[PDB]
Symmetry: C3
Subunit: 435 residues, 3 copies
């Protein structure tokens, strides 16, 4: 299962063992609620005005390397469908197909065959239960049943109200679990995809959008926009990097280097999907949920940067500085510690206290027997996930650089770019020498 | 209406056709709820203890270029009013003016004439409905009416609880739609401003704050802080930029350049308001809602950077790198595609599939007939907004630069700054030549 | 109390007078709800199916200098406990200890002695109130009491549903105020710590996590993860910095410099905790709530950068540019104004209007008599906190630099790094001179 290697030479760690679940596409579907246009009945008269107020609100609704990412439009697929429902006869084409069945496909005269779904029939209820008796007296409940149907409308309306028509995650009121699962059952997708979504509906919900579309002809329509997971069960690995600095006694005489390529990496279609912001990803035990909108597509060679950062096949990205501050990175199965200067850095067991005091430099410790890590005044709990760690001994590459000609304000840089800068300044040095 | 030009020479696009709605100021108003200090009645006894618990909770409450932005204090206007209500007699000055009318102006003895507003009178209700009968028996409902008044208190209290006294957006419980609209009617603002806010109350709500102020003398007061839109119906345009790189076969021999000045631009008072984070802005069809807190004020000359980026009147901002990664930017009426290296970049129609395969470089495609764009493993839906696009053919300016003396780690840079760097290094070259 | 000095020489301001409250550790505790496994009764039959649906949802849940910060794992302490509850007999060890008392310590056979707490006993209720009568008829309410117990379950379930098992802030449904306060009473902490948390429960709530742990053996368990405030009542001060530029008439001939070390500073354990993102901190009157996860530990010498930025004991961090844009920073007791170019910058009184027009450069004004500040098209309200300001006159240090050899794209830089860059280029100049 989960494993982790630490590289002393580059102050970085890789956690492998994970399986992908990447949102690669969207599945849109039109969700409809049909509406009515209007002593134990005083309850019903109350709920009935809660009703009109919701309808009223609804009508008011009308009238390091992350900077390298592109810029999408997350709900462009859903709004594309909404804009079509505004065509005339298009709300009736839906209203007609959803007469004798609660789920139908409406060819929207735009290209898409959209799955339409009537989740709530208030129009029918109010007109075939409340309307005949509103012409004084109430039976049994009924009162209960209406309060339940209606409350859902109020919840949906409250969400669209506070979010100005677009919500996420998709609540159980936008789409109940039984509705969602039947939607999943009728998706043109592999059985693996269906079981993945069913075992993780709340994650699925979190990657979905609900877009308020239209109120017209006693019908409320919103578009639910669900994730397509086109990439599933491919290898994933997370890269943790921390500043690697020299440790000369004299303050400010030090140089530093950080691999800037931290994030999630997943094998994808012959390339590797890279996610520079490792919080656009959510881990569940050993399954990594990601969104390809927040990714770059890179050559698979990129993994060579961990094995060997000076390699000729991929140019590994680094940043440089003279800023030797202490800090820690909490990995999947341990902790990276960049201890510099006068800082007090330790690792501790819950019951025994400090078991390791860190030297200046960059070091690593596994969660096996260690509960917390301390850098300066910052206490970090480590992840207590079960796995195996490997410490890969090696000379910190920062020691291979002469501080005199080291370039120290590079951010969008790399190993070859830095060497190029060094060569250039050694050229100048050997040319003034001959003077 | 909406239109868009793409500039091949600078890998950028401008969407024009939009109308401004900029929050330029705040409108504060004190909102008050008067409180009471204490078999079908067992319901009322229940709601009455829900009441005391809310009061209890309430009392506990007491005792690219974005880095160039300034730093405001969003609720400083509202807290300014709150701090005054803590003066003595100031809660009574309010409580006295709101005796026979539900809406009054209280001169707060600080300068401001604040609009005071009593939205809920629980004190009166409990003491003139529940208190006389609590001395055993219940009439009719009444039970219903109290549950409704009280539920609002509980909703307001829940919001102030989970947000530690400051909430946004302002919910329909903080301020109902009928209350908000009457507030809007009595605002010292132009009719255009009133219709704008009325046609978009949920957006208005989203730009408002609710600040819990005080509980004192059987009175709950919070300050609602509503947006003033001082700039309305002025031209707006959004700028989309993407990395422009050379495309030499040999990996890593390439240079790149990105216009760093993407964002919203709105004509404002003889200058142009620039919003570097184009998600501090929300578009509704063709109206752009923005906040001037998140803006810079620039010369109107800034638009010349699109027509002609080498112009003498404004120095256009760019960043440089050697990092030729592929990506896409989804514009208002199409997509910009920066395809580099081995990446597979295409555009597709829903029903027909791939209709264009992109060459290495920077290119553009309109939403007219194109539904999705693909860069590497990333599928992007384009916006299906109705508009007209224009492709402005031109030589990519990156081809005008000799890679040998190109400065490649500039972020906070510009066209003239880069030329200055180039001149300097050509000076050195022509001085070593004469050796 | 609160005071503020402005430094004209470096365009910066320091607000002192604050007292710390730093989350330094976590306090975890297992919270349990015991569950049942199954005409006025039609209400109860309703609430009973709301019940089963919640249980159903719950079971589905199973199966400038911020870039210098380290990377923690916020809920690693809580999940550590959760993973233990999944051991066998571990849910029964809890269920057994919580038989005759509602609060017990369960030695989890892992090391920790965790505080276990049964907040809601639905199993007992349903089986000792509803189950004997479900074998037709209902007494009194009871109906009310069940609706209240059950509603809490539904609220807890709704939160865990929409947040996929991890929530924050911890709601009054996860943990009521009376439960929280008893938890606080039994914490191994100083009386100062207890009074601090009791006077600020909503802030405490905002720094807490609730982590859904397990459903097993008619028991629901979640881990509430509360903040430990190990540092309390130590001096804090916030640093405000703004761009300091030259003001030569000719556009683009100017140089700029910004102290990049803005944020919160708190005295902590012989060092100083620095918080580069001053919105990971929340002020309540004069108490600063912070999280040490978002901090660096620095030498106490760092405060010398305000007194004297050219000092030999700490190297003060600055960034440089040629980008002279106007902006403002709203401080605790006034405003910093960086006015450059053609921008219109003013300060105004509510009742009197413009009382100061700013010259080009960097200037400051206190909240005493000033209500708003205007830079370009941006209106800023100042904070109306009561305090004393001091303007420290001084030559802006930017005027000490020759523009010809000034390094203008440094971000991760400092005063000594810049001088070093200058010396190097003056070396080259004096060596070409002798030619
Ligand atoms: O995003 C960046 N940049 C880009 C960058 N370069 C610059 C040069 C001069 C002036 C400003 C510059 N900025 C803007 C940084 C604004 C952060 O709030 C960085 C440069 N050096 C070190 C870390 C950097 N990061 C971190 C990932 C957050």
């Amino acid at each position: 299962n989960i494993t982790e290697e630490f590289y002393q030479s580059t102050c970085s760690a890789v956690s492998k063992g994970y399986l992908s679940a990447l949102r690669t596409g969207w599945y849109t579907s039109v969700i409809t609620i049909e509406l009515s246009n209007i002593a134990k009945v005083k309850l019903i008269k109350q709920e009935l005005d809660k009703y009109k107020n919701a309808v009223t609100e609804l009508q008011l609704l009308m009238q390091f390397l992350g900077f390298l990412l592109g810029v999408g439009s997350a709900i462009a697929s859903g709004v594309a469908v909404c804009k079509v429902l505004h065509l005339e006869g298009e709300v009736n084409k839906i209203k007609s197909a959803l007469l004798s069945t609660n789920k139908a496909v409406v060819s929207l005269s735009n290209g898409v065959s959209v799955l339409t779904f009537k989740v709530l029939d208030l129009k029918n209820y109010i007109d075939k239960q409340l309307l005949p008796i509103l012409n004084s007296i109430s039976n049994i409940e009924t009162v209960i049943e209406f309060q339940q149907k209606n409350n859902r409308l109020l919840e949906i309306t409250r969400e669209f109200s506070v979010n100005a028509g677009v919500t996420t995650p998709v609540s159980t009121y936008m789409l109940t679990n039984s509705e969602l699962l039947s939607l999943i059952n009728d998706m043109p997708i592999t059985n693996d995809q269906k079981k993945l979504m069913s075992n993780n509906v709340q994650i699925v919900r979190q990657q979905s959008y609900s877009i308020m579309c239209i109120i017209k002809e006693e019908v409320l329509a919103y578009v639910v926009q669900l994730p397509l997971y086109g990439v599933i069960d491919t290898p994933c690995w997370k890269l943790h990097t921390s500043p690697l600095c020299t440790t000369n006694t004299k303050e400010g005489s030090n140089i530093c280097l950080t691999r800037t390529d931290r994030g999630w990496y997943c094998d994808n279609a012959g390339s590797v999907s890279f996610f520079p912001q490792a919080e656009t990803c959510k881990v569940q035990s050993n399954r990594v949920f990601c969104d390809t909108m927040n990714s770059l597509t890179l050559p698979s060679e990129v993994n060579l940067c961990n094995v060997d950062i000076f390699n000729p096949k991929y140019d590994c990205k680094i940043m440089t500085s003279k800023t030797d501050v202490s800090s820690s990175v909490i990995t999947s199965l341990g902790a990276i510690v960049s201890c510099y200067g006068k800082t007090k850095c330790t690792a501790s067991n819950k019951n025994r206290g400090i078991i390791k005091t860190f030297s200046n430099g960059c070091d690593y410790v596994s969660n096996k027997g260690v509960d917390t890590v301390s850098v300066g005044n910052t206490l970090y709990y480590v992840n207590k996930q079960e796995g195996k760690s490997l410490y890969v001994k090696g000379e910190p590459i920062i020691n291979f650089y002469d501080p005199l000609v080291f370039p120290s304000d590079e951010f969008d840089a790399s190993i070859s770019q830095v060497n190029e800068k060094i060569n250039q300044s050694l050229a100048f040095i050997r040319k003034s020498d001959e003077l």
